[PDB]
């Protein structure tokens, strides 16, 4: 029986000092002589209403999800969830120095392995990779391919170059070779403006707008032929919504019928391609939790296979992890969302 | 000149005329004719003559819209027989994309902004004298330099009161998002002239064509245009721009429509949690749509299930959807064939008539 | 009341970096902004909550000997009095506050929320006058303003810029458009009205990559690369004709090195001889603008392999428009007793220490 | 005896149709149906003062250097020059479509080979590469490496990512394996603003300020480790000035001393590295043609080995190709600029 997998939860790094046990003498020494600057990112600003639930378990500084103990107590308290896919968003991808980027990413996965995955066999995790260097990113996947507690590859929603450019094919190759899905999570490297029209001036405007970048990443991945070069690839959109997908699929489909000879390795419709290769987490639900609207978006998607359950612990969204049940009248759709669709990604059982 | 009137005809909010070769020079200072001969019209490319994504098949033009000489949309008579008469369009909004000949890039996007303004004024004296006044079923959306608000204001103040001008024309891409304070002097002059603003499909702006890298293939390119309109909608709304200009009307031309409806729906959902960052935003983000945000229809969204079109347009805002042909581009839309066979007649009539009359101020 | 600054035996230091102690700004900030910063921090052009895109390397790039008992270097007013103002006989030391908190480079004016940024600047200017300038008027302030929101910048120049405690307006090397663009002209205008020159200090951010061909990897790249922003700004300020519009505007490039300017200007002149026909509105040969309009501070002093070249290159730039600075308390601090090469001529060193800074600040 | 090499002269593509006999039918058909948009760059606007001196032979449209017979006529008329290194700046690197970029660069090099190299044995040429796809770039250099008339690899001064990025390593590896120096020539892919502070509003401003990008490139190539990993690399800076180098070199060097542990592989001073591996063409001379100034700048470079003669034919610059003689009183130095410095690059004997 396929397990109830919570496909998106977060471990939050307490400080860059937490990496010192997992860094070589050179990097550890340097990190301390640098007065250890923190790459804590601004995707979920720590004092904003999205960072953590009022009633989340917290530490001595009032921050949620900085220990597996605290996270486990909360996510599994009510017996509903069988496994949780941990994503640590600590911003090693915004480390410009390419070799520090490699070192701190590898150190972060060690911290996840030794202080999260070793503390509870209900925890799985994504591999943080240094995406400033796709070959070193490919090698970080390879480095963790043998620890199947690592079940996917973490990539940011905004990258330096689009993910379908040849430059990035080592990332896709290494994931298919490892049998690992690739997830895009909300966030970015911020090496250009986060929109094609400049810098969003509020976090709110930035958070909402990043759907647009996923459209870009999906078209890039499909148009450049990732799905024909690496045809076992599976993509998870983590914490990026999904209600925007159907209007995007329809226009991609329309224009592919015009421009197929420009991309002739694409003989299936991007509608079908997306339905088969792309999945999405349910937190935030962006209003599909509203009456009938989960049935509607499924219909607009043309598939009940794409949505997979997540709570996005510990982030506070407008609707809760299981408020998605109010968007549908179908217990079978809830079965796919709660367990069956994610079996496509992780093959985990009870 | 008589105020426009829409009775049994329709509204077309996106028509692309081009000046014939040399047609703008009567309206150009000698300094700029000379500049163009020696320098062309430099823009945010490294390319002398074309934009960074040149048009793929035959210039993206209808095969049947090529006059006996010149570019499509460069024949005044061909435009009135083939588009205005043919479809009984009683309000056709001109959106001059290019001065034509040297370049197809928007006049406002010249890196020399004094030249940019020169080209916008030239386009405006031209289209008003060569199309609008000989055939006032046509009205102009006047292009202006959004990246130099000083000059935009000067031009709105010069022409904007003209009865043959129905709107102010900017671009979908810009150096900063359209709700930024940089552009407020333009909104203020527009409002002062009682003029709505139309933002059309564009390349350029100063940043890549997506928020995460330049696209490679034509599907990425052409689908990618919706992203810019998605960013501008969120900027314009969440900046409080519409609290500052509560009569300002903005229309998004050729950015599609249905994608705006789950954008807005995601905007509200997020805002429910994070509104505290923006404590001066006077309304819930979706509450600004009906009074401020309109969209042209072309290229019509084609859902897999035809009944989803009507649904999604209603979810955007069924009053704020305005017909457009995009004559004479390749994905041109025809008023009889664009809408699916199950499309509610009442929505369709007001997309064709009432909605454009409201946005453009026709009563 | 403060007396007008006076430089006799002492020297000009054009770049001192104080930081407020924790909470020192709070009596000058609205609670709104206090709460905003608690939740969101000071959001800018990064995806980072607390640090800029290039955090400094060894020891926070601060002098290992300038730390106070508790607090960041430059936050101890008594330490700054003894270690800098007393120890080197500085009679006009120009404050350039580049952080609200306890960091090296986090400019208030580069917050993406430009109301927060204007508030942070207003608070920094009330603090530094009150806490540093008035208690020891050997310091005078360069006032940070929001260059990317001209309306707010002008309002701050009008508010506090006539104070005798203020000797310049403070900007960053990195901007969304080149500083000769018309966007910034309203700031140049209000500064000329307040008889204030403008200082542009080394910065990150601005909105583009830190080079014009990609983000840097290693600290040799980042730190050497700061030079490139200043080259790009000089060219824009000169060639745009900004100084044709503002004949009395004086700008100083702070902490962007000096030597490299000279071959740059030599290249600009040489190219203009051929290509001047693109810029016919320019009234002077581009190099002629230097002497009256462009100054440069010295830290970090250039160190040629043959030390006679320094004086040669400083003169080729403009011997009259180079101004001393220490950059206290950063790690590459320049000691006036040791910064200059041994063959350096005393005429040049002494006007660098006194007369050139005196003329840029009108002392 | 080492030969007088004009190290930078230009071939100008008459129109995209000249490419058709060297493109596959798919790209040849595709070109005519696009109505053949021309990727003619804006680095030297064809109607501006710098495009050509009034003495250059022109074609039916008034353009210079569209045929080999016109260039060869002009460049060799007075017998001074023995060889000339032809660079074609046609904007294949601004084709976003990565397959069309590979195909059009391939067709451009073929065009140089058949319509220039085959027509006068005094001509050599650079290899144009699809730098949007660095492993296609590496393959392109390899393809032409067998034709010894091709004597260097062309890259533009402004690139998508800095040329020392590991993404770009394949190019430096292919050039080294081919025995070919790499030239950076003024020009760009314009995939960001060409300065760190946004877009220059005029060509004059852009052209003057591209030197700032070459500093970025040199600091990247060296700091990233290109000269230790590919230690036979030779970098020619073509038509970027050169008087800016000394101040840059001193600052890079002093900052190297500050940041030693950051780049442990760089164990020689960047001054020594730049003096060994970097060469620069003399056209434009940017004022070093004035009395004593050539002697001065060589004194500031600290090497007489770096400057190599070029005319930049057919471009118009304030001083002429031989005016450099006015800035020196040393025939030895002129012998270095005219012949012996370029021998390090091409080994062309007269
Ligand atoms: Fe998440
Ligand atoms: Fe259109
Ligand atoms: Fe169109
Ligand atoms: Fe400083
Ligand atoms: Fe400093
Ligand atoms: Fe050249
Ligand atoms: Mg004049």
d(CA A278, CA A272): 10
Asked if B246 contacts B188 with a C-beta cutoff of 8 angstroms, the reply is no
Strand partners, A198: A195
Asked if A8 contacts A239 with a C-beta cutoff of 8 angstroms, the reply is yes
DSSP B269-320: HHHHHHGGG-TT--S-GGGGHHHHEEEE-PSPP--SSTHHHHHHHHHHHTTS
Please state, in angstroms and as integers, the Cα–Cα distance from residue A218 to each residue in A126, A277, B46, C114, C350, following that order: 20, 10, 28, 33, 63
| Structural domain spans, chain A | 5-346
Identify the domain containing residue B64 by its residue range: 10-360
C84 contacts: CB under 8 Å, gap ≥ 6: C13, C16, C90, C93, C326, C328, C329
- Long-range (24+ apart) CB contacts under 8 A made by B181-185 are B181/C114, B181/C149, B181/C151, B182/B149, B182/C183, B183/B146, B183/B149, B184/B149, B184/B241, B184/B244, B184/B245, B185/B149, B185/B150, B185/B152, B185/B153
d(CA B91, CA B163): 13
CB contact under 8 A, A134 and D167: yes
3-state secondary structure of B356: helix
Asked if D10 contacts D88 with a C-beta cutoff of 8 angstroms, the reply is yes
d(CA D118, CA D68): 10
Strand partners, A255: none
Residue C13, by phi and psi: left (phi above 0), alpha (psi -120 to 50) or beta?
beta
| CB nearest to D167's CB, from A30, A97, A167 | A167
d(CA A97, CA A108): 16
Phi, psi (rounded to 5 degrees) for C62: -100, 155
DSSP state of B82: I
Exposure string of B51-83, with b = 16+ CB inside 10 Å and e = fewer, is bbbbbbbebbbbeebbbeebbbbbbeebbbebb
Sign of dihedral through CA atoms B75, B76, B81, B87?
positive
Phi, psi (rounded to 5 degrees) for D7: -85, 5
Number of other CB atoms surrounding residue B210 within 10 Å: 27
Sign of dihedral through CA atoms A170, A173, A177, A180?
positive
**Greatest distance between any 2 Cα atoms in chain C:** 61
DSSP state of B2: P
CB contact under 8 A, C51 and A38: yes
Q: Which residues of B are annotated as a binding site for Fe(3+)?
A: 14, 16, 200, 254, 326, 329
Smallest Cα distance from B137 to chain A, Å: 32
d(CA A318, CA B227): 24
d(CA D334, CA D97): 45
CA C4 to mean position of chain CA atoms? 21
Helix (H) or strand (E) run with residue B350 in it: helix B345-352
Measured in angstroms, the resolution is 2.3
Number of other CB atoms surrounding residue A332 within 10 Å: 10
Q: From ligand 3's centre to the CA of B330, what distance in Å? A: 8
Q: From ligand 2's centre to the CA of B158, what distance in Å? A: 25
Strand partners, B345: none
CB contact under 8 A, B47 and D94: yes
With a CB-CB cutoff of 8 Å, which residues 1-40 of chain D face chain A?
Answer: 30
Q: Tell whether C273 is within 8 A of chain D (Cβ).
A: yes
CA-closest candidate to residue C190, choices C232, C253, C146, C235: C146
Residues lining ligand 4 (ion), CB within 5 A? C 15, 255, 327
Q: Tell whether B265 is within 8 A of chain D (Cβ).
A: no
- The token pair at B161 is 């009161």
User: Which residue bears the tokens 């008003």?
Assistant: B128
d(CA B203, CA B207): 10
- The token pair at B205 is 């702006």
CB contact under 8 A, A30 and D261: yes
Residue B60 is assigned to a structural domain of this protein: yes
| Mutation to test the C interface, candidates B277, B278, B280, B281, most C Cβ within 10 Å | B277
CB contact under 8 A, A248 and B174: no
Residue B3 is assigned to a structural domain of this protein: no
CB contact under 8 A, A199 and C218: no
Smallest Cα distance from A255 to chain C, Å: 32
Please state, in angstroms and as integers, the Cα–Cα distance from residue B4 to each residue in B135, B288, C180, C328, following that order: 11, 27, 43, 68
Asked if A96 contacts C214 with a C-beta cutoff of 8 angstroms, the reply is no
CA-closest candidate to residue C140, choices C20, C14, C245: C14
Q: Strand D123-128 to strand D150-158: parallel, antiparallel, or no bridges (unpaired)?
A: parallel
Name chain C contacts of D157, Cβ cutoff 8 Å: 213
Is A10 annotated in some ligand binding site? yes
Please state, in angstroms and as integers, the Cα–Cα distance from residue A328 to each residue in A134, A237, A239, A306, B311, following that order: 41, 21, 20, 15, 18
A308 contacts: CB under 8 Å, gap ≥ 6: A5, A7, A236, A279, A280, A281, A282, A337, A341, A342, A345
Which chains have 3+ CB pairs within 8 A of D?
A: A, B, C
D77 contacts: CB under 8 Å, gap ≥ 6: none
Q: Tell whether D101 is within 8 A of chain A (Cβ).
A: no
| CB nearest to C151's CB, from B38, B113, B181 | B181
d(CA A308, CA A47): 28
DSSP C188-226: HHHHHHTT--EEEE--S-BTB-SSTT----SHHHHHHHH
Residue C89, by phi and psi: left (phi above 0), alpha (psi -120 to 50) or beta?
left
Name chain C contacts of B30, Cβ cutoff 8 Å: none
Residue C4 is assigned to a structural domain of this protein: no
Nearest residue of D to residue C182, measured between CA atoms: D201
Helix (H) or strand (E) run with residue D235 in it: strand D235-238
CB contact under 8 A, D40 and B48: yes
Q: Tell whether B113 is within 8 A of chain D (Cβ).
A: yes
SS3 string of chain A? CECCEEEEEECCCCCHHHHHHHCCHHHHHHHHHCCCCCCCECCCCCCCCCCCCCCCCECCCCCECCCHHHHHHHHCCCCCCCEEEEECCCCHHHCCCHHHHHHHHHHHHHHHHHHHHCCCCCEEEEEECCCCCHHHHHHHHHHHCCCCCEEEEEEEEECCCCCCCHHHHHHHHHHHHHCCCEEEEEEECCCCCCECCECCCCHHHHHHHCHHHHHHHHHHHHHCCHHHHCCCCCEEEECCCCCCHHHHHHHHHHHHHHHHHHCCCCCCCHHHHHHHHEEEECCCCCCCCCCCHHHHHHHHHCCCCCEECCCCCCCCCCCCCCHHHHHCCCHHHHHHHHHHHHHHHHCCEC
User: Which residue bears the tokens 């080592």?
Assistant: A170
Please state, in angstroms and as integers, the Cα–Cα distance from residue A344 to each residue in A240, A276, A347, B102, B177, following that order: 19, 10, 6, 54, 40
Residue B2 is assigned to a structural domain of this protein: no
The CATH code that applies to domain A5-346 is 3.20.20.140
CB contact under 8 A, C214 and D316: no
Q: Tell whether B39 is within 8 A of chain C (Cβ).
A: yes
Residue B263 is assigned to a structural domain of this protein: yes
Name chain A contacts of D30, Cβ cutoff 8 Å: 261
User: Which residue bears the tokens 């692309």?
Assistant: B16
Phi, psi (rounded to 5 degrees) for A173: -60, -45
User: Which residue bears the tokens 């001209």?
Assistant: C150
Nearest residue of A to residue C40, measured between CA atoms: A45
CA-closest candidate to residue D245, choices D296, D316, D182, D202: D296
Smallest Cα distance from D16 to chain A, Å: 19
d(CA A336, CA C99): 51
Name chain C contacts of A38, Cβ cutoff 8 Å: 49-51
Alpha helix ranges (H) inside chain C: 31-40, 77-80, 114-128, 150-160, 185-193, 219-239, 242-245, 261-275, 290-293, 308-318, 346-350, 356-360
Asked if A210 contacts A188 with a C-beta cutoff of 8 angstroms, the reply is yes
CA-closest candidate to residue B352, choices B10, B87, B88, B90: B10
CA-closest candidate to residue D322, choices D288, D345, D279, D289: D289
Residue C274 is assigned to a structural domain of this protein: yes
The total number of structural domains that make up chain B: 1
Q: From ligand 2's centre to the CA of B167, what distance in Å? A: 15
User: Which residue bears the tokens 């220990």?
Assistant: A67
Nearest residue of D to residue A224, measured between CA atoms: D98
Helix (H) or strand (E) run with residue D252 in it: helix D245-258
Q: Which ligand sits nearest to residue A43's alpha carbon?
A: 1
Name chain C contacts of D196, Cβ cutoff 8 Å: 174, 206, 208-212, 225, 228-229, 232
CA-closest candidate to residue D278, choices D312, D254, D253, D308: D308
What is the radius of gyration, based on Cα positions, of chain B?
19
Q: Strand D83-88 to strand D123-128: parallel, antiparallel, or no bridges (unpaired)?
A: parallel
d(CA A153, CA C65): 45
CB contact under 8 A, A97 and D160: no
CATH number at residue B133: 3.20.20.140
- The token pair at C27 is 């009596």
Residue B354 is assigned to a structural domain of this protein: yes
Residue B245 is assigned to a structural domain of this protein: yes
């Amino acid at each position: 029986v396929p397990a109830v997998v919570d496909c998106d939860v977060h471990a939050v790094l307490p400080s860059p000092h937490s990496l010192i046990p997992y860094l070589d003498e050179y990097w550890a020494d340097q990190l301390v002589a640098q007065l250890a600057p923190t790459y804590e990112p601004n995707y979920h600003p720590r004092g904003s209403a999205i960072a953590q639930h009022s009633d989340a378990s917290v530490d001595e500084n009032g921050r949620a999800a900085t220990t597996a103990e605290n996270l486990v107590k909360d996510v599994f308290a009510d017996g509903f969830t069988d496994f949780a896919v941990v994503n640590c968003l600590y911003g090693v991808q915004q480390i410009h120095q390419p070799r520090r980027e490699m070192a701190h990413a590898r150190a972060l996965n060690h911290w996840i392995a030794n202080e999260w995955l070793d503390k509870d066999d209900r925890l799985r995790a994504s591999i943080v990779v240094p995406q400033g260097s796709p070959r070193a990113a490919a090698e970080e996947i390879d480095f963790w391919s043998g620890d199947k507690r690592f079940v996917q590859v973490l990539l940011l929603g905004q990258s330096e170059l689009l993910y379908g450019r040849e430059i990035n094919w080592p990332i896709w190759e290494a994931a298919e070779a490892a049998g690992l899905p690739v997830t895009l999570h909300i966030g970015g490297v911020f090496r250009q403006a986060p929109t094609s029209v400049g810098w969003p001036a509020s976090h709110l405007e930035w958070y909402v707008g990043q759907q647009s970048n996923i459209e870009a990443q999906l078209n890039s991945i499909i148009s450049e032929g990732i799905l024909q070069k690496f045809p076992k690839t599976k993509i998870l959109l983590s914490e990026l919504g999904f209600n925007w997908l159907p209007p995007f699929m329809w226009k991609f489909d329309k224009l592919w019928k015009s421009y197929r000879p420009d991309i002739p390795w694409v003989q299936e419709s991007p509608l079908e391609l997306i339905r088969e290769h792309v999945r999405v987490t349910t937190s935030p639900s962006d209003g599909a939790e509203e009456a009938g609207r989960l049935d509607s978006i499924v219909d607009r998607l043309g598939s009940d296979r794409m949505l997979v359950y997540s709570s996005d612990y510990p982030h506070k969204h407008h609707s809760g992890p299981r408020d998605i049940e109010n968007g549908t009248h179908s217990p079978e759709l809830l079965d796919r969302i709660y367990r069956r669709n994610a079996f496509d990604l992780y093959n985990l059982v009870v | 000149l008589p105020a426009p009137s829409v009775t049994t005809g329709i509204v077309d909010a996106d028509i692309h005329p081009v000046p014939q070769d040399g047609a703008l020079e009567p309206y150009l200072d000698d300094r700029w004719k000379k500049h163009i001969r020696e320098y062309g019209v430099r823009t945010t490319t490294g390319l002398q003559f074309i934009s960074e994504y040149p048009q793929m098949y035959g210039g993206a033009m209808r095969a049947d819209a090529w006059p006996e000489s010149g570019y499509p949309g460069s024949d005044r008579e061909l435009l009135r027989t083939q588009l205005l008469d043919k479809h009984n369009i009683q309000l056709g909004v001109l959106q001059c994309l290019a001065p034509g000949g040297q370049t197809l890039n928007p006049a406002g996007q010249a890196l020399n902004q004094e030249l940019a303004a020169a080209l916008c004024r030239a386009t405006n004296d031209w289209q008003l004298e060569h199309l609008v006044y000989p055939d006032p079923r046509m009205r102009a959306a006047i292009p202006v330099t959004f990246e130099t608000p000083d000059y935009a204001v000067a031009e709105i103040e010069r022409v904007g009161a003209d009865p043959g001008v129905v709107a102010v024309l900017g671009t979908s891409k810009t150096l900063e998002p359209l709700g930024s304070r940089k552009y407020w002097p333009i909104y203020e002059a527009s409002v002062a002239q009682n003029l709505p603003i139309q933002f059309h499909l564009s390349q350029g702006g100063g940043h890549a064509n997506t928020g995460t890298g330049w696209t490679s293939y034509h599907t990425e390119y052409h689908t990618g245009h919706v992203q810019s309109f998605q960013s501008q909608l969120l900027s314009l709304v969440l900046s409080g721009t519409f609290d500052r200009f509560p009569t300002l009307k903005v229309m998004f031309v050729e950015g599609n429509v249905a994608h705006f409806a789950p954008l807005i729906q995601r905007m509200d959902y997020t805002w429910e949690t994070l509104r505290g960052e923006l404590p001066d935003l006077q309304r819930k983000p979706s509450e600004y749509i009906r009074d401020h945000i309109w969209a042209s229809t072309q290229p019509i969204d084609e859902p897999e299930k035809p009944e989803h079109l009507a649904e999604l347009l209603e979810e955007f805002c069924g009053d704020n959807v305005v017909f457009a042909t995009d004559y004479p581009h390749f994905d041109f839309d025809d008023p009889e064939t664009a809408f699916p066979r199950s499309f509610p007649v009442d929505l369709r009539d007001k997309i064709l008539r009432g909605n454009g009359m409201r946005f453009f101020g026709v009563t």
